Amino acid sequence: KTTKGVQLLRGDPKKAIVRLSIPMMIGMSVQTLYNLADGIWVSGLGPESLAAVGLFFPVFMGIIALAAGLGVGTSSAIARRIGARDKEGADNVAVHSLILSLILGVTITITMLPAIDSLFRAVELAIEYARVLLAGAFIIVFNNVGNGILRGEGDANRAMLAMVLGSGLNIVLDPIFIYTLGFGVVGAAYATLLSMVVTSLFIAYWLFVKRDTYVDIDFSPSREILKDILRVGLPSSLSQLSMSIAMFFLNSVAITAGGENGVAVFTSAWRITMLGIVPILGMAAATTSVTGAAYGERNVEKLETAYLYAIKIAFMIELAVVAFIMLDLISALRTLPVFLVLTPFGMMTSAMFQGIGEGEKSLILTIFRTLVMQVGFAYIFVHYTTLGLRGVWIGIVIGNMVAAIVGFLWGRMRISALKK
Ligand SMILES: CCn1cc(C(=O)O)c(=O)c2cc(Br)c(N3CCNCC3)cc21
DSSP states (O other): OOOTTHHHHTSOHHHHHHHHHHHHHHHHHHHHHHHHHHHHHHTTSOHHHHHHHHHHHHHHHHHHHHHHHHHHHHHHHHHHHHHTTOHHHHHHHHHHHHHHHHHHHHHHHHHHTTTHHHHHOOHHHHHHHHHHHHTTHHHHHHHHHHHHHHHHHTOHHHHHHHHHHHHHHHHHHHHIIIIISOOTTHHHHHHHHHHHHHHHHHHHIIIIIIOOSSSOOOOOOOHHHHHHHHHHHHHHHHHHHHHHHHHHHHHHHHHHHHTTTTHHHHHHHHHHHHHSSHHHHHHHHHHHHHHHHHHHTTOHHHHHHHHHHHHHHHHHHHHHHHHHHHOOHHHHTTTGGGGTTTTHHHHHHHHHHHHTTOHHHHHHHHHIIIIIIIIHHHHHHHHSSSOOHHHHHHHHHHHHHHHHHHHHHHHHHHHHHTTO
C-alpha cells in the first residue's frame, strides 16, 4: 500500500526536505567528482583530441539536456500524483515516461548518427566519439527516466545508489580505456557507454524485477499525462542548456579580462565551486519532490514550509562550505564563493516551480540567473572597469544577488497566488 519514500512526502515537510536531500547530495558528489576527473584525463591527451571535444560537446550536452529534463518532468509528475493520493495516475506517468524514453532515445540516435558525419566536417576522433555516444542515447535517457521515477517517489537512497554505482564505475573505467587500453578520447565515451549499460541493468532490476517501487509498472495513453511530463521536461532541458552556454560566455569574459593566464584561473575556480554547490543541487532535487507532493495535497502552507525550510538549511550549509573555502586563484577563492550563499535562494525557487508544474517560470528564472545577471554583470565589470580578472568574480557574486532577490520574491508571490 505505502512505501518509506511516499510516507516521507505525505508527512512532515521539514523532515522530507532533509531525509531526501542527503542521499541526493552524496549521489551528486560522486557525479561532480567524475566531471572533475574526466576533464583531467582528457586534458593532456593533446590539442587535437581537445579540438575533437569541442566538436561533439554541443551535441553531447544536447543529449544530456534532453535526458535530464525528461527525468525532472517524470519526477515532477509522479510527486504530484503521490501527493494527491492518485496511484493509477502515478503508475501511468512511469509507463508513459519509459515509452517516452524509448521514442526520444531512438529518435536522437536515428536523427543524429547518420547526420553527424556531415556536421563535423581531430574530425575523425570526433565522429568516433559521437558514434559511441549516439548509439547508446536510449540508454542515457532510460537511466534519467528510471532516476526520475525513484526521485519522484521518495526513493532518494535507491536514486543515490544509481548515480554512485553510476559515476563510480566511470571514475574507475575512465583511465583504463583512455590510457591502459589506449582508445584515447573515444575511450572516455566508451567508458561512459559501458558504464551506462551496467547501471541500466540495475535500474530495470529494481523497477521491473524487484518491484520495490511504490508505483506498478493501469496504463492508458492520456494526453493529460503527456502534457504534464513535457510541461516540466522541455523547459528543464533548455535550463541545463543555457547553463552550459553561460559557462562558455563567462569563459570568453575570462579571456578578455585576464587572457589565457588567466582562463586557467577561471577553470580552477569553477571546479572547486562545482563541488561547493553540490548541497544546493542535492536539496533542489529534494525540494521538487516535496513541493510537488504538497501541491498534490493542495496544501499551500506545507508547500510554503518546505520551500522556506529548504532555503534556510541550504543557506547555513553554504555558510559552512564557504568557511571551508576561505580557510591568482587564491584571491578569487575569497570573493567568488560568496555567491554560493545567494544561490539557494534562486535554485530552490526554480525547483519548486518544477514541483508545481510550472516549468516555464523555471526556465525564465534560470536564464535571468545564469545568463542575464551572471554573464551580464561579469561582462560589464570587465569591459567598463579598471578591474580585470577580479571584476569577473565580483560580477558573478553581484549578479547572483539580483537573481536571488527576484527569485525569492517571485517564489513567495506565486505561493501567495496559490491561495486566492
Ligand atoms: C554509469 C552511468 N552513468 C555514466 C555517466 C557518465 O559516463 O558520464 C554519468 O554521467 C552518469 C550520470 C548519472 Br546522474 C547516472 N545515474 C543516475 C541516472 N540513472 C543511472 C545512474 C549514471 C551515469
